[PDB]
Amino acid sequence: TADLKSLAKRIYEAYLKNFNMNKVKARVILSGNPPFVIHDMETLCMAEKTLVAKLVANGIQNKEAEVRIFHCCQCTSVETVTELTEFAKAIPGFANLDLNDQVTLLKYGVYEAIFAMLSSVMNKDGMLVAYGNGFITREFLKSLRKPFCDIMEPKFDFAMKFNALELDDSDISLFVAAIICCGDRPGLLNVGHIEKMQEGIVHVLRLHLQSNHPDDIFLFPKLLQKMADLRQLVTEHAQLVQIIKKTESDAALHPLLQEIYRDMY
Ligand SMILES: CCCCCCCCCCCCCCCC(=O)O
């Protein structure tokens, strides 16, 4: 229907406006200011001097490479949280929710959305970083000292299967909106209204996938399962972050992310 197709287009346009990275932009870069390839410590350190110069301007006081990398991971998440917060305003009913419910939905949804969207910048060999200006290899990330080598690999595993679904930005935008609209998040004040907001977005997602992916009759339930898989990926990620927090004193957690993780798992 015109209203439902228009809603899907709205959410797609809001996604293109609000996220610095989209799947088309990522694919243009990945196909070959080209991205600097980070595949070892030499190339990490060269990339840092150009792309995150302040982080390595401290001489012998610079942090360990793994800690610098984790800091850059967190800065990326902080920026994506800001983008997701603006995007959520395009979702029918979201801005009409109580301010506290908006906070709760974003708190529990952002990392699920982050890992879903991260797939768009990942291939089997590595991922784009730093606003598309670096490509860091999967093998380099696996080579880091424990526990830091354990951060990205499960996200690559998720992404390879997610990317095999061959979603486009029009699908991913609605999937991210659906992640944000979960009525079963803890602490919600108006569950009923959130459930109806969820039902509306999920209806739009179902119809859109039927229209955009006529070849895959299971795509909607596949994506419902991916949402559950993302919840488990995030719980596991939070457990690893808590290990880092307890055992890696140099790996300072950004305060916005500390609040997101607080009282989550
Ligand atoms: C010189 C640039 C080095 C870049 C280092 C890798 C950046 C990865 C960005 C994606 C991070 C995904 C994981 C987020 C982790 C978290 O916020 O808890």
- Residue 220's identity, in one-letter code, is F
194 CB within 6 A, ligand 1: no
Is any ligand 1 atom within 6 A of the Cβ of residue 234? Answer: no
HSE-up of residue 210 (Cα within 13 Å, Cβ side) = 8
Q: Which residue in 166, 177, 182, 167 sits closest to 8, CA to CA?
A: 177
For the chain, domain boundaries: 1-265
> Residue 142 Cα, ligand 1 centroid: separation in angstroms?
13
The amino acid at 253 = L
The answer to whether 86 touches 18, Cβ cutoff 8 Å, is yes
Resolution of the determined structure in angstroms stands at 1.2
Ligand 1 within 6 A of CB of 141: no
Say how far apart CA 108 and CA 230 lie, in whole Å: 11
User: DSSP states of 157-185 as a string?
Assistant: HHHHHHHHT---HHHHHHHHHHHH--TTS
Q: How many CB atoms lie within 10 A of CB 225?
A: 11
Residue nearest ligand 1's atom 1 by CA: 48
Residue minimizing CA distance to atom 10 of ligand 1: 73
Question: How is residue 152 written in tokens?
Answer: 């990205």
Task: Give 94-117 as a DSSP string.
Answer: TTTS-HHHHHHHHHHHHHHHHHHH
132 touches ligand 1 (CB under 6 Å): no
Nearest CA to ligand 1 atom 12: 73
Nearest Cα to Cα of residue 171 among 210, 132, 141, 134: 210
Instruction: Determine if residue 77 is labeled as part of a ligand binding site.
Output: yes
Question: Are 11 and 173 in contact, with CB atoms under 8 Å apart?
Answer: yes
* Closest-CA residue to 219 (of 177, 171, 156): 171
Cβ of residue 77 lying under 6 Å from some atom of ligand 1: yes
